Design a protein around this ligand. Structure first.
Ligand SMILES: C[C@@H]1O[C@@H](O[C@H]2[C@H](O[C@H]3[C@H](O)[C@@H](O)[C@H](O)O[C@@H]3CO)O[C@H](CO)[C@H](O)[C@@H]2O)[C@@H](O)[C@H](O)[C@@H]1O
Ligand SMILES: [Ca+2]
Length: 132
């Protein structure tokens, strides 16, 4: 059972699309989700991707960018999820991750129907999604 305000399919997810001045870095977003007892959202299969897409449609958060729990590990690991669990299912956008200019070590979701991922600099301010 998920809490009533969390979207379910299982993992539970919640969108945080806040004011223009209330976005957070990847690390700030991770700390926020962990303070709730959860973490930044991981997308581990097509069912979880659909759960989050339907959360986006229900909110009207179209076109927005969201932090996911994607973080680059060691060179041999590549991207992992924020709790260290491995990236198995992937939905990177075309050409991604491209580590553009060698400074992109966190992952963001483009919240449109493609639900694609991009690596981006971790100090960008974005919306975020938590899991619990
Ligand atoms: C926005 C960026 O998109 C991918 O990086 C691509 C890169 O983006 C350029 C964009 O074309 C340009 O309008 C903007 O002013 O600067 C961006 C770079 O920060 O463009 C190159 C072509 O030169 C490639 O197509 C890159 O894929 C994405 O990978 C980045 O993380 C970022 O979201
Ligand atoms: Ca990129």
């Amino acid at each position: 059972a998920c809490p009533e305000d969390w979207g379910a399919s299982s993992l539970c997810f919640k969108l945080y699309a806040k004011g223009k001045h209330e976005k957070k870095t990847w690390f700030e977003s991770r700390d926020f989700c962990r303070a709730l007892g959860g973490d930044l959202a991981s997308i581990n299969n097509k069912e979880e991707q659909q759960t989050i897409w339907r959360l986006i449609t229900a909110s009207g958060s179209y076109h927005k960018l969201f932090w996911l729990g994607l973080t680059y590990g060691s060179p041999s690991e590549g991207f992992t999820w924020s709790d260290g669990s491995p990236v198995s299912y992937e939905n990177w956008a075309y050409g991604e991750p491209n580590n553009y200019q060698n400074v992109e070590y966190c992952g963001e979701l483009k919240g449109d129907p493609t639900m694609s991922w991009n690596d981006i600099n971790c100090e960008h301010l974005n919306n975020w999604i938590c899991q619990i």
